[PDB]
Amino acid sequence: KELTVYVDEGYKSYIEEVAKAYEKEAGVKVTLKTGDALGGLDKLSLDNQNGNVPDVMMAPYDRVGSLGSDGQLSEVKLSDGAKTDDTTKSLVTAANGKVYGAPAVIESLVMYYNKDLVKDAPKTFADLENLAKDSKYAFAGEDGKTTAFLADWTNFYYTYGLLAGNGAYVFGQNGKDAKDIGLANDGSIVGINYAKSWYEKWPKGMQDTEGAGNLIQTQFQEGKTAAIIDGPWKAQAFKDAKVNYGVATIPTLPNGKEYAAFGGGKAWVIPQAVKNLEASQKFVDFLVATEQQKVLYDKTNEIPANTEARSYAEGKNDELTTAVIKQFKNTQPLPNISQMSAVWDPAKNMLFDAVSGQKDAKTAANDAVTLIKETLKQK
Q: Is 107 annotated as a binding residue?
């Protein structure tokens, strides 16, 4: 009779609509519950053991695999109507490896460019190098620096595409072998050096131990940079700032490989102590079925995982949507094993160390690897 859905406030308009259709197609009552998504998944470790859990909720793909493995979520049956491809199925399959969610949304980093500064989206990294050549991008305050292209490359999430595109990887077996860490392989090193090559030509504020993003955002808004790398979550900010931006796929690396960013996004998930696993599964099936997924984009702009609704989304001829769609084809999974937490800090520091001149590219890398190695085993 009743199904409770715990979502972020941003889904109120989405759930209320989807609920009325479901309630009038099957005979079950959908009651929404506003909250905080990530916080809700935290308090789920100590909620299954009492059953005071909602029937359906939402979770990012990395949290699907962690919570999954740590027995916090019921398994999910993937239906034909969910239209999951190998890569989205992959995204909801934990290490062991059963499925623990139905893919709802996908995301990836994109390139934003200023149309008042360039006629076309830079297609390659060379193209971006040539724009740093042009004097009209020189940074006032020091020399010889540009703002022609800025990326938050002290951020591992931002910088990962650059490294992996050159041949790096966090864990082996597409993020499963914790004994096989590739953040210090030859590709990882040239990638790091490549970032370094930029930072030598960038305003020293880019090396800020915290808010590099703000500077990058400022520069794009005031119209001082031609292209940046950032997520879809920045779009509004640029809209507000009345910037004439366009959105394309991240330019391809000088080695000719695509910018291998982390494949982001969210899944519909079922707590393990739900009152009726079948009832939940049915509603989750209804949630990933082409129409609801189509409606999800309509009401939130979030790019659908269901491939059918994804093409629908593509068909909207919107630059951000399409770029996210196209860039995702080339993304790599954020490893969902619990050992990912041992990476964030050593890998963040690897970046700062190398770009700030504290360490050469080989040293920072190695140091981070053997430090991730150590936080593992002390598991």
A: yes
What's the total number of domains in the chain? 2
| In a shared domain, residues 295 and 276 | yes
Same domain, yes or no: 129 and 224:
yes
CATH code (residue 235)? 3.40.190.10
- 8 Å CB contact between 238 and 230: no
CA distance 27 to 20: 11
Using what technique was this structure determined? X-ray
- State the DSSP string of 34-56: EE-HHHHHHTTTTTTTT----SE
**How many angstroms is the resolution?**
2.9
- The closest alpha carbon to 331, from 259, 230, 254, belongs to 259
294 is in an annotated binding site: no
Q: Tell me: is residue 213 an annotated ligand-binding position.
A: yes
- Tell me the DSSP string of 204-257: GGGG-SS-HHHHHHHHHHTT--SEEEE-GGGHHHHHHTT--EEEEPPPBPTTS-
Residues followed by a break in the chain (C to N exceeding 2.5 Å) are: none
Does residue 357 have a known ligand-binding role? no
Phi, psi of 242 (to 5 degrees): 45, 45
CB atoms within 10 A of CB 65: 30
Domain of residue 352 covers 109-261+336-379
Residues 180 and 210 in one domain: yes
| Residue 373 annotated as lining a ligand binding site | no
**Is the same domain home to 204 and 279?**
no
> How far apart are alpha carbons 312 and 297 in whole angstroms?
9
Say if residue 142 carries a ligand binding annotation.
no
CB 92 within 8 A of CB 63: no
Cβ pair 190, 165 in contact under 8 A: no
187 is in an annotated binding site: no
Q: Are residues 61 and 191 in the same domain?
A: no
- Residue 86 annotated in ligand binding: no
| 233 is annotated as contributing to ligand binding | yes
133 and 192 within one domain = yes
